[PDB]
């Protein structure tokens, strides 16, 4: 539908965001994911810390370097979930995966572009209220991700400027509606009203 779809990761359940992201890829749809730090996993924090340690122990015994690699960043974790869902050792695998970009925070370009959500992966619409869950940033920080604070900093800034943007907009669209209202009642307006506009 669009040349790039930028997804606000916040409030999405790691598995189902991945499951829809992978599909879109394979079907030709480039995707960028922002705010992987605010991604969720169900199950409380300890379970998900525990699991990550289970992953942590796996390594090639003759050379921990040639063995399985453990990435700490919320984005790289998101990427792992995703890669699992692509035939990634195939050219068609690699092709699909270059259509994808994952980020912590919302860096340039994408912060002036609109981001969307994936309702079938929205935790708030999916997890039974009561169930405990884990936020990706926290989990990541406890296994060595180094940059939670810096992202928090940059995001707090970004949020300030975006609020200005929003203020100005809302201001302008108040004028716009004040216009659209004087032009209401006109001959052209009732006509448009009769055709469903």
């Amino acid at each position: 539908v669009e040349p790039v779809v930028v997804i606000d990761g916040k409030g999405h359940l790691v598995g189902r965001l991945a499951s829809v992201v992978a599909k879109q890829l394979l079907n030709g749809q480039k995707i960028v994911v922002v705010r992987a730090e605010e991604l969720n996993i169900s199950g409380e924090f300890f379970r998900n810390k525990l699991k990550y340690h289970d992953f942590l122990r796996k390594a090639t015994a003759f050379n921990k370097t040639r063995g399985p690699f453990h990435f700490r960043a919320p984005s790289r974790i998101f990427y792992k979930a995703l890669r699992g869902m692509v035939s990634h050792k195939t050219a068609r695998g690699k092709a699909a995966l270059e259509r994808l970009k994952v980020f912590e925070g919302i860096p340039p370009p994408y912060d002036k572009k609109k981001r969307v959500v994936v309702p079938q992966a929205l935790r708030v619409l999916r997890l039974k209220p009561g169930r405990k869950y884990t936020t990706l940033g926290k989990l990541s920080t406890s296994v060595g991700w180094k940059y939670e604070d810096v992202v928090a900093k940059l995001e707090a800034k970004r949020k300030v400027s975006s609020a200005e943007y929003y203020a100005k907009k809302r201001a302008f669209t108040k004028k716009v509606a004040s216009a659209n209202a004087t032009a209401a009642e006109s001959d052209v307006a009732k006509q448009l009203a009769a055709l469903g506009y």
Binding site: V5, G11, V117, P119, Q120, L125
Partner: protein, 172 residues
């Protein structure tokens, strides 16, 4: 076992020259079609009389329809079941609109709470409980209080498209 109808089955022991006109026995049977209904019939008969399908005959098979299919009704239900360790009796109450709906949900319930498959159950009795206050189970009673109302908090709308431009709201 499916979506149930209720049938009267009537059957009766082949006539003999010495005993023409044998006794005639009926059951109400909950089953999805009449082929099961008659099987089901013979299975309970062979548990009460000397008979089997080979020496008896079905006289009649008629589906019985709910008399007041839009009256909410409080049903009492009586069941015999088999567990992995032995065999047990039970009484449950089920609020619905027809015995047929009601038997439908007994079976789901027996499956879900007791891991009872259709084979392991005998419906012993299903009867509309006339006066409230003969209603004995709290999960039904709850619904018979005066002027009853309730919200349905935390609403989830089904999304029709993969991507959404908003950020939903569960208000209601």
């Amino acid at each position: 076992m499916a979506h149930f109808k209720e049938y009267q089955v009537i059957g009766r022991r082949l006539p003999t020259e010495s005993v023409p006109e044998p006794k005639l026995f009926r059951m109400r049977i909950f089953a999805s079609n009449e082929v099961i209904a008659k099987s089901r019939y013979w299975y309970f008969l062979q548990k009460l009389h000397k008979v089997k399908k080979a020496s008896g005959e079905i006289v009649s098979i008629n589906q019985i329809n709910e008399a007041h299919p839009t009256k909410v009704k409080n049903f009492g239900v009586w069941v015999r079941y088999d567990s992995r360790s032995g065999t047990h009796n039970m009484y449950k109450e089920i609020r619905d609109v027809s015995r047929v709906a009601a038997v439908e949900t007994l079976y789901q319930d027996m499956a879900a709470r007791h891991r009872a498959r259709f084979r392991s159950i005998h419906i012993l009795k299903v009867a509309e409980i006339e006066k409230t206050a003969d209603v004995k189970r709290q999960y039904v009673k709850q619904f018979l209080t005066k002027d009853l109302k309730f919200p349905l908090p935390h609403r989830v709308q089904k999304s029709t498209k993969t991507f959404s431009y908003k950020r939903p709201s569960t208000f209601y």
